[PDB]
């Protein structure tokens, strides 16, 4: 039908906010969450797209930046922690399971249990190897 | 500016796939078991365009005559509307009518879109070229499924073209805040890594379109 | 009391106020029904209130009178029938002062006027309603919210009440109606009431647009509400052509020439696009209706009974018209617009190909001039309009009269393929998509084949839009070029055809497609894997090297195409035809039981390797499981070529794959899968045999699942027993069978639904009793130690089907097989079959109904039964 109406606002200015930021990688994937809060044990959906591995310009703080597809709204948001390793999942090459104790995907932080796949193994050891960098560096820096 | 709010009535037959729908646009994901709802659930859902942010509340009803509560008392300063029926039973396609009926005689012009589901289930009984409601009162119509994916932002963004009015209208990037620098205690972090075992044994489920 | 409270609690977006309020409403009606309705009413009918409470109030009222269940419909029809008069002539009398006292635009009181006159009407118990609400709408000193509500009141009366309940007054409503929706209405809001009520109203006066004096002053009145300057009247008065044109097509003829063609054809010019909508869909509803009255009279010319209804056939009379505004409509495009938006555009095109199917070869000439003139337009809006008339116009007419057409444009859209627009592109391609889809005989010869491949080969590194309409035109290129006469030889297969000298260069770029990092969008990807089987499938004898690698560097992908095996669902690529359904399901079989030619058992390697190596990356469990199951079945199947001796994969991992038995068609599917590999080999069975009759028998015998299960577990019983057994003895089906006579047939032997299952499982005992003896029988002499030669099998029968005496259920069909085979198999094992004789002769019945289906199937196997007897009577 028809309701256009006042409520039509200006243009303003669109800002992603990752800006100040340098873009290490970029690749299409799949998320998944492990739902444990009923009472057995399942794992949930979480979204679709392009996941990117951002790295501050002087910070120097990598996160992990995962969007949704057509809707472009977050499905997952956080830092990386030395402590975070990625591991194989039950008997699949292209997939790996991690967790996080602050996800800000939804604005507030949650614990989190995660599992990314990609499409084949080549883009599995890809960001297998961009995110074990990412961590030594880290790691490096907290050191010092 | 309350980030410009909108009801939207959500109204259809008991299998359809109303709360599925809502479900995978509020969290992601897939709910394989039908729990029919009792009377009336709302959600809100923001979406981000170039004009800025819109926020729906989404009045997911009862499609089950036992369950209704306030069946017609829901439509009331409502703002858009959605009328979903499955593509895989004909009787959910046959009570379009009545639901627009009961919309319109509450409701003076409001945006209504007709939306057909579970389009992916194959051997689909109401073929494409038996849906003429949309043509008869010049209503927008849409093919989605919540399994896939597919479509399933289209009717959101016909309605927010709609209700402000810009025809060139698109969902651009949700800003991307900055998440916050926490620390656990070491017992819940050996919890946690229990649960990364527990986790790690699990396997995950086996689907497509990566 | 605070209902005002309670009412206004219900548009909170809370859910404990709304449970509060939803409790509250519940309990009070629940108490006292009359009180209950009699505060609802006073809340409504006072203007003092809010808006939400009044029209919450109304709502309340209304749904304690109807629902959408029509017997919980009837039930509350008669509780208000059954309260005192006095309070149900107090909550009418409230109802009844409240119209044109709401000052919003959609009233509430009009549902309760109307939900309660359905139910006082039919018994007289309301008679001065309807002369009340006709006084207020002729009324010269009504005000418009009087007029509006009591029009909508009309309307919803009207529509919801029976037809034959108001037929003694029905012309004083509509002479209301009419009176609201004239002319000289002061307010629009008036004429749009109006227009809606007679809308409405429509199948309500279905007596008075039997009457010329009627009918008349109803079309004049909606052919000059077309003309209102206030676009929301002139739209509900084309609605209302629609469904008088949908309602009374037969009243028509008067009116289509002076009045209705004119006002509709200045409607599909119009700038609006609501209004152009309309006028469109007036010519689409005329086509569906002259195509219902055109198979309505085709089905009376076979019957051989002239039509109920004729035709007249407006459409063919007003092409001349029709055609030029459509085709100029589709010119009403953007750069970024979207496919699916349903805008005066997308409607022209389904209007167009409506008329196409309705009017056949007499829209070609309309069409050609316009295709003709704009197919090189320096604005793009008009090339890509003359693509899309093209492609619409394509289903319908004569491929005769088509063929010239396509040969000569054909060079014009290979060079739009490369069109410097993203639109004309698309469109381009889904037209030689639909060129080669159902012109099969015109792109295919000959001047323009190398070129054409040429482009589509280039196209397929396009937007995946384009390249999915370029799969599927590749597929159906492939399957023209294979059914063609092209195709040569008395082999039953082409030696070569016309895409043997680009067919690696095809099958390779296919190849190269599927591995997209964008083969997501439009299912771009499955669309390959399906082109992917078609070419394959339809080949020649002299790509076959091409075809074998192919099909070598499918199957290592069988797990990730078996998953996507359910995720194509169509909507894309292959447009209108589907056939066989799924992207797998018999196509991959399909493709797998025709690609076997010069043994090539290294397509059988890869693919139980395949097979194997995902049943153990499942790592127990495993649903999709089953999709692998019944593929190995097809590739046993009848593949003897290469695959009557499998004996060598799947033998340990059988009872592995039938391990899983918490799903049910995966078990029956194994069972399926055991029955059809037993009479395979019969040589590595032997081991397993114990296993799965035990694990299956414990299976049935608890978990109960009966219904599925059991029949075909019985069946394979018998089948395995056909070569293999003798160590078993016959207890096992002994039991069972004795179960199974005298509680799932004595009981109610009956009804419709529960013989199928009685009658199959019957066949299957049947059927399995004889293959018990001829497996024991030794095929020799007896080779066994014939004890059970007629003490258990021959007493047994004659009491186990003698429950079919007790009504006779038709069982058409094998239950002759199964009286031959017991016939022949009692026959040929001993003497004592003359007590079968001695007992009820039911089986002649069971022979009189299996007599019913002619004598192929029925009579030859009772004759065999027979004449085995008489053999024995001479014998004895
Ligand atoms: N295969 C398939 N199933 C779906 C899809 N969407 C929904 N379903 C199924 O349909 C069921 C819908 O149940 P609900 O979510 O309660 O839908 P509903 O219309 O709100 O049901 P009521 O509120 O009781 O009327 C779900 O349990 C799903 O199993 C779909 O896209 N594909
Ligand atoms: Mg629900």
Same mark, same amino acid.
């Given at each position: 039908?028809?309701?256009?109406?006042?409520?039509?606002?200006?243009?303003?200015?669109?800002?992603?906010?990752?800006?100040?930021?340098?873009?290490?990688?970029?690749?299409?994937?799949?998320?998944?969450? =492990? /739902?444990? @809060?009923?009472?057995? !044990? *399942?794992?949930?959906?979480?979204?679709?797209?392009?996941?990117?591995?951002?790295?501050?310009?002087?910070?120097?703080?990598?996160?992990?930046?995962?969007?949704?597809?057509?809707?472009?709204?977050?499905?997952?948001?956080?830092?990386?922690?030395?402590?975070?390793?990625?591991?194989?999942?039950?008997?699949?090459?292209?997939?790996?399971?991690?967790?996080?104790?602050?996800? =800000? /995907?939804? @604005?507030?932080?949650? !614990? *989190?249990?995660?599992?990314?796949?990609?499409?084949?193994?080549?883009?599995?050891?890809?960001?297998?190897?961009?995110?074990?960098?990412?961590?030594?560096?880290?790691?490096?820096?907290?050191?010092? | 500016?309350?980030?410009?709010?909108?009801?939207?009535?959500?109204?259809?037959?008991?299998?359809?796939?109303?709360?599925?729908?809502?479900?995978?646009?509020?969290?992601?994901?897939?709910?394989?078991?039908?729990?029919?709802?009792?009377?009336?659930?709302?959600?809100?859902?923001?979406?981000?365009?170039?004009?800025?942010?819109?926020?729906?509340?989404?009045?997911?009803?009862?499609?089950?005559?036992?369950?209704?509560?306030?069946?017609?008392?829901?439509?009331?300063?409502?703002?858009?509307?959605?009328?979903?029926?499955?593509?895989?039973?004909?009787?959910?396609?046959?009570?379009?009518?009545?639901?627009?009926?009961?919309?319109?005689?509450?409701?003076?012009?409001?945006?209504?879109?007709?939306?057909?589901?579970?389009?992916?289930?194959?051997?689909?009984?109401?073929?494409?070229?038996?849906?003429?409601?949309?043509?008869?009162?010049?209503?927008?119509?849409?093919?989605?499924?919540?399994?896939?994916?597919?479509?399933?932002?289209?009717?959101?963004?016909?309605?927010?073209?709609?209700?402000?009015?810009?025809?060139?209208?698109?969902?651009?990037?949700?800003?991307?805040?900055?998440?916050?620098?926490?620390?656990?205690?070491?017992?819940?972090?050996?919890?946690?890594?229990?649960?990364?075992?527990?986790?790690?044994?699990?396997?995950?489920?086996?689907?497509?379109?990566? | 009391?605070?209902?005002?409270?309670?009412?206004?609690?219900?548009?909170?977006?809370?859910?404990?106020?709304?449970?509060?309020?939803?409790?509250?409403?519940?309990?009070?009606?629940?108490?006292?029904?009359?009180?209950?309705?009699?505060?609802?009413?006073?809340?409504?009918?006072?203007?003092?209130?809010?808006?939400?409470?009044?029209?919450?109030?109304?709502?309340?009222?209304?749904?304690?009178?109807?629902?959408?269940?029509?017997?919980?419909?009837?039930?509350?029809?008669?509780?208000?029938?059954?309260?005192?008069?006095?309070?149900?002539?107090?909550?009418?009398?409230?109802?009844?002062?409240?119209?044109?006292?709401?000052?919003?635009?959609?009233?509430?009181?009009?549902?309760?006027?109307?939900?309660?006159?359905?139910?006082?009407?039919?018994?007289?118990?309301?008679?001065?309603?309807?002369?009340?609400?006709?006084?207020?709408?002729?009324?010269?000193?009504?005000?418009?919210?009087?007029?509006?509500?009591?029009?909508?009141?009309?309307?919803?009366?009207?529509?919801?009440?029976?037809?034959?309940?108001?037929?003694?007054?029905?012309?004083?409503?509509?002479?209301?109606?009419?009176?609201?929706?004239?002319?000289?209405?002061?307010?629009?809001?008036?004429?749009?009431?109006?227009?809606?009520?007679?809308?409405?109203?429509?199948?309500?006066?279905?007596?008075?647009?039997?009457?010329?004096?009627?009918?008349?002053?109803?079309?004049?009145?909606?052919?000059?509400?077309?003309?209102?300057?206030?676009?929301?009247?002139?739209?509900?008065?084309?609605?209302?052509?629609?469904?008088?044109?949908?309602?009374?097509?037969?009243?028509?003829?008067?009116?289509?020439?002076?009045?209705?063609?004119?006002?509709?054809?200045?409607?599909?010019?119009?700038?609006?696009?609501?209004?152009?909508?309309?006028?469109?869909?007036?010519?689409?509803?005329?086509?569906?209706?002259?195509?219902?009255?055109?198979?309505?009279?085709?089905?009376?010319?076979?019957?051989?009974?002239?039509?109920?209804?004729?035709?007249?056939?407006?459409?063919?009379?007003?092409?001349?018209?029709?055609?030029?505004?459509?085709?100029?409509?589709?010119?009403?495009?953007?750069?970024?617009?979207?496919?699916?938006?349903?805008?005066?555009?997308?409607?022209?095109?389904?209007?167009?190909?409506?008329?196409?199917?309705?009017?056949?070869?007499?829209?070609?000439?309309?069409?050609?001039?316009?295709?003709?003139?704009?197919?090189?337009?320096?604005?793009?809006?008009?090339?890509?309009?003359?693509?899309?008339?093209?492609?619409?116009?394509?289903?319908?007419?004569?491929?005769?009269?088509?063929?010239?057409?396509?040969?000569?444009?054909?060079?014009?859209?290979?060079?739009?393929?490369?069109?410097?627009?993203?639109?004309?592109?698309?469109?381009?391609?889904?037209?030689?998509?639909?060129?080669?889809?159902?012109?099969?005989?015109?792109?295919?010869?000959?001047?323009?084949?190398?070129?054409?491949?040429?482009?589509?080969?280039?196209?397929?590194?396009?937007?995946?839009?384009?390249?999915?309409?370029?799969?599927?035109?590749?597929?159906?290129?492939?399957?023209?070029?294979?059914?063609?006469?092209?195709?040569?030889?008395?082999?039953?297969?082409?030696?070569?055809?016309?895409?043997?000298?680009?067919?690696?260069?095809?099958?390779?770029?296919?190849?190269?497609?599927?591995?997209?990092?964008?083969?997501?969008?439009?299912?771009?990807?499955?669309?390959?894997?399906?082109?992917?089987?078609?070419?394959?499938?339809?080949?020649?004898?002299?790509?076959?090297?091409?075809?074998?690698?192919?099909?070598?560097?499918?199957?290592?992908?069988?797990?990730?195409?078996?998953?996507?095996?359910?995720?194509?669902?169509?909507?894309?690529?292959?447009?209108?035809?589907?056939?066989?359904?799924?992207?797998?399901?018999?196509?991959?079989?399909?493709?797998?039981?025709?690609?076997?030619?010069?043994?090539?058992?290294?397509?059988?390697?890869?693919?139980?390797?395949?097979?194997?190596?995902?049943?153990?990356?499942?790592?127990?469990?495993?649903?999709?499981?089953?999709?692998?199951?019944?593929?190995?079945?097809?590739?046993?199947?009848?593949?003897?070529?290469?695959?009557?001796?499998?004996?060598?994969?799947?033998?340990?991992?059988?009872?592995?794959?039938?391990?899983?038995?918490?799903?049910?068609?995966?078990?029956?599917?194994?069972?399926?899968?055991?029955?059809?590999?037993?009479?395979?080999?019969?040589?590595?069975?032997?081991?397993?045999?114990?296993?799965?009759?035990?694990?299956?028998?414990?299976?049935?015998?608890?978990?109960?699942?009966?219904?599925?299960?059991?029949?075909?577990?019985?069946?394979?019983?018998?089948?395995?027993?056909?070569?293999?057994?003798?160590?078993?003895?016959?207890?096992?089906?002994?039991?069972?069978?004795?179960?199974?006579?005298?509680?799932?047939?004595?009981?109610?032997?009956?009804?419709?639904?529960?013989?199928?299952?009685?009658?199959?499982?019957?066949?299957?005992?049947?059927?399995?009793?004889?293959?018990?003896?001829?497996?024991?029988?030794?095929?020799?002499?007896?080779?066994?130690?014939?004890?059970?030669?007629?003490?258990?099998?021959?007493?047994?029968?004659?009491?186990?089907?003698?429950?079919?005496?007790?009504?006779?259920?038709?069982?058409?069909?094998?239950?002759?097989?199964?009286?031959?085979?017991?016939?022949?198999?009692?026959?040929?094992?001993?003497?004592?079959?003359?007590?079968?004789?001695?007992?009820?002769?039911?089986?002649?019945?069971?022979?009189?109904?299996?007599?019913?289906?002619?004598?192929?199937?029925?009579?030859?196997?009772?004759?065999?039964?027979?004449?085995?007897?008489?053999?024995?009577?001479?014998?004895?």
């Amino acid at each position: 039908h028809f309701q256009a109406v006042v409520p039509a606002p200006d243009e303003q200015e669109i800002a992603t906010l990752e800006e100040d930021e340098e873009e290490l990688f970029c690749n299409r994937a799949k998320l998944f969450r =492990f /739902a444990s @809060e009923n009472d057995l !044990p *399942e794992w949930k959906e979480r979204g679709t797209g392009d996941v990117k591995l951002l790295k501050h310009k002087e910070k120097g703080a990598i996160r992990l930046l995962m969007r949704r597809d057509k809707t472009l709204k977050i499905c997952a948001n956080h830092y990386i922690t030395p402590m975070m390793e990625l591991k194989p999942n039950a008997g699949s090459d292209r997939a790996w399971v991690w967790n996080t104790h602050a996800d =800000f /995907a939804d @604005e507030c932080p949650k !614990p *989190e249990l995660l599992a990314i796949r990609f499409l084949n193994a080549e883009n599995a050891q890809k960001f297998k190897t961009k995110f074990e960098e990412c961590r030594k560096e880290i790691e490096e820096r907290e050191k010092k | 500016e309350p980030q410009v709010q909108f009801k939207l009535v959500l109204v259809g037959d008991g299998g359809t796939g109303k709360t599925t729908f809502v479900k995978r646009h509020l969290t992601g994901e897939f709910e394989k078991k039908y729990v029919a709802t009792l009377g009336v659930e709302v959600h809100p859902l923001v979406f981000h365009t170039n004009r800025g942010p819109i926020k729906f509340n989404v009045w997911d009803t009862a499609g089950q005559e036992k369950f209704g509560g306030l069946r017609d008392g829901y439509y009331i300063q409502a703002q858009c509307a959605i009328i979903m029926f499955d593509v895989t039973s004909r009787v959910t396609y046959k009570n379009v009518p009545n639901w627009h009926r009961d919309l319109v005689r509450v409701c003076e012009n409001i945006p209504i879109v007709l939306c057909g589901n579970k389009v992916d289930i194959k051997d689909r009984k109401v073929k494409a070229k038996s849906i003429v409601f949309h043509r008869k009162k010049n209503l927008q119509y849409y093919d989605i499924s919540a399994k896939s994916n597919y479509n399933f932002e289209k009717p959101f963004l016909w309605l927010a073209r709609k209700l402000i009015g810009d025809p060139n209208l698109e969902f651009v990037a949700m800003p991307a805040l900055a998440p916050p620098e926490v620390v656990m205690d070491p017992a819940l972090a050996a919890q946690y890594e229990h649960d990364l075992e527990v986790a790690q044994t699990t396997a995950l489920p086996e689907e497509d379109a990566a | 009391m605070e209902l005002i409270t309670i009412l206004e609690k219900t548009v909170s977006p809370d859910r404990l106020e709304l449970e509060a309020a939803q409790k509250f409403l519940e309990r009070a009606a629940v108490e006292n029904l009359p009180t209950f309705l009699v505060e609802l009413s006073r809340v409504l009918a006072n203007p003092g209130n809010s808006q939400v409470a009044r029209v919450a109030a109304g709502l309340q009222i209304k749904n304690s009178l109807t629902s959408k269940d029509p017997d919980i419909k009837a039930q509350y029809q008669q509780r208000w029938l059954a309260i005192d008069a006095n309070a149900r002539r107090e909550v009418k009398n409230y109802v009844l002062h409240t119209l044109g006292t709401e000052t919003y635009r959609p009233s509430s009181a009009s549902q309760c006027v109307a939900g309660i006159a359905c139910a006082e009407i039919p018994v007289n118990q309301w008679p001065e309603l309807i002369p009340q609400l006709v006084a207020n709408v002729t009324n010269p000193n009504s005000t418009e919210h009087m007029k509006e509500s009591t029009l909508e009141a009309i309307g919803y009366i009207c529509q919801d009440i029976d037809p034959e309940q108001l037929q003694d007054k029905s012309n004083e409503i509509l002479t209301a109606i009419i009176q609201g929706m004239r002319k000289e209405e002061p307010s629009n809001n008036v004429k749009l009431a109006a227009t809606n009520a007679l809308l409405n109203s429509l199948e309500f006066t279905k007596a008075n647009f039997d009457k010329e004096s009627e009918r008349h002053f109803i079309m004049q009145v909606v052919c000059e509400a077309t003309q209102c300057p206030d676009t929301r009247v002139r739209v509900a008065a084309l609605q209302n052509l629609v469904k008088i044109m949908s309602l009374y097509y037969q009243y028509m003829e008067t009116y289509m020439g002076p009045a209705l063609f004119a006002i509709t054809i200045e409607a599909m010019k119009s700038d609006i696009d609501e209004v152009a909508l309309q006028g469109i869909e007036f010519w689409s509803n005329v086509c569906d209706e002259e195509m219902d009255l055109a198979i309505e009279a085709s089905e009376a010319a076979e019957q051989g009974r002239p039509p109920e209804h004729t035709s007249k056939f407006y459409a063919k009379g007003a092409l001349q018209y029709l055609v030029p505004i459509l085709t100029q409509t589709l010119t009403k495009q953007d750069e970024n617009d979207d496919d699916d938006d349903w805008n005066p555009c997308k409607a022209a095109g389904v209007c167009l190909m409506l008329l196409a199917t309705c009017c056949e070869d007499d829209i070609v000439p309309h069409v050609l001039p316009f295709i003709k003139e704009h197919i090189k337009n320096p604005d793009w809006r008009y090339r890509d309009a003359a693509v899309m008339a093209f492609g619409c116009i394509l289903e319908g007419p004569e491929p005769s009269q088509l063929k010239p057409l396509v040969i000569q444009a054909m060079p014009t859209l290979i060079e739009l393929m490369k069109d410097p627009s993203v639109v004309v592109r698309d469109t381009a391609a889904w037209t030689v998509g639909r060129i080669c889809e159902l012109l099969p005989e015109a792109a295919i010869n000959d001047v323009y084949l190398a070129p054409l491949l040429q482009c589509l080969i280039e196209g397929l590194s396009a937007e995946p839009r384009v390249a999915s309409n370029v799969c599927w035109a590749f597929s159906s290129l492939a399957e023209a070029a294979y059914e063609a006469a092209d195709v040569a030889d008395d082999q039953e297969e082409p030696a070569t055809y016309c895409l043997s000298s680009s067919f690696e260069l095809i099958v390779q770029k296919l190849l190269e497609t599927t591995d997209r990092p964008d083969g997501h969008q439009n299912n771009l990807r499955s669309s390959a894997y399906e082109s992917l089987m078609e070419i394959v499938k339809n080949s020649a004898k002299d790509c076959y090297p091409a075809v074998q690698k192919t099909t070598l560097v499918i199957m290592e992908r069988l797990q990730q195409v078996l998953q996507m095996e359910s995720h194509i669902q169509s909507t894309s690529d292959r447009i209108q035809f589907n056939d066989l359904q799924s992207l797998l399901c018999a196509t991959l079989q399909n493709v797998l039981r025709k690609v076997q030619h010069q043994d090539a058992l290294q397509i059988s390697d890869v693919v139980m390797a395949s097979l194997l190596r995902m049943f153990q990356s499942t790592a127990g469990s495993g649903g999709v499981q089953e999709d692998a199951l019944m593929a190995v079945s097809t590739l046993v199947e009848v593949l003897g070529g290469e695959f009557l001796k499998y004996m060598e994969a799947f033998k340990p991992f059988l009872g592995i794959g039938l391990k899983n038995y918490a799903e049910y068609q995966v078990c029956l599917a194994a069972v399926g899968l055991v029955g059809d590999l037993c009479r395979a080999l019969q040589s590595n069975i032997i081991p397993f045999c114990d296993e799965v009759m035990q694990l299956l028998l414990e299976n049935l015998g608890n978990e109960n699942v009966h219904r599925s299960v059991k029949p075909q577990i019985l069946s394979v019983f018998g089948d395995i027993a056909l070569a293999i057994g003798g160590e078993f003895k016959k207890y096992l089906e002994v039991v069972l069978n004795t179960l199974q006579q005298a509680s799932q047939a004595q009981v109610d032997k009956s009804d419709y639904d529960m013989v199928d299952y009685l009658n199959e499982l019957r066949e299957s005992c049947l059927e399995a009793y004889t293959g018990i003896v001829q497996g024991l029988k030794g095929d020799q002499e007896n080779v066994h130690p014939d004890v059970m030669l007629v003490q258990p099998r021959v007493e047994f029968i004659l009491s186990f089907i003698d429950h079919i005496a007790g009504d006779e259920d038709h069982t058409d069909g094998v239950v002759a097989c199964a009286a031959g085979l017991i016939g022949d198999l009692c026959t040929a094992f001993g003497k004592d079959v003359l007590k079968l004789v001695e007992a009820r002769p039911m089986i002649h019945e069971l022979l009189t109904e299996g007599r019913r289906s002619k004598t192929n199937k029925a009579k030859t196997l009772a004759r065999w039964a027979t004449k085995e007897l008489r053999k024995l009577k001479n014998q004895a």
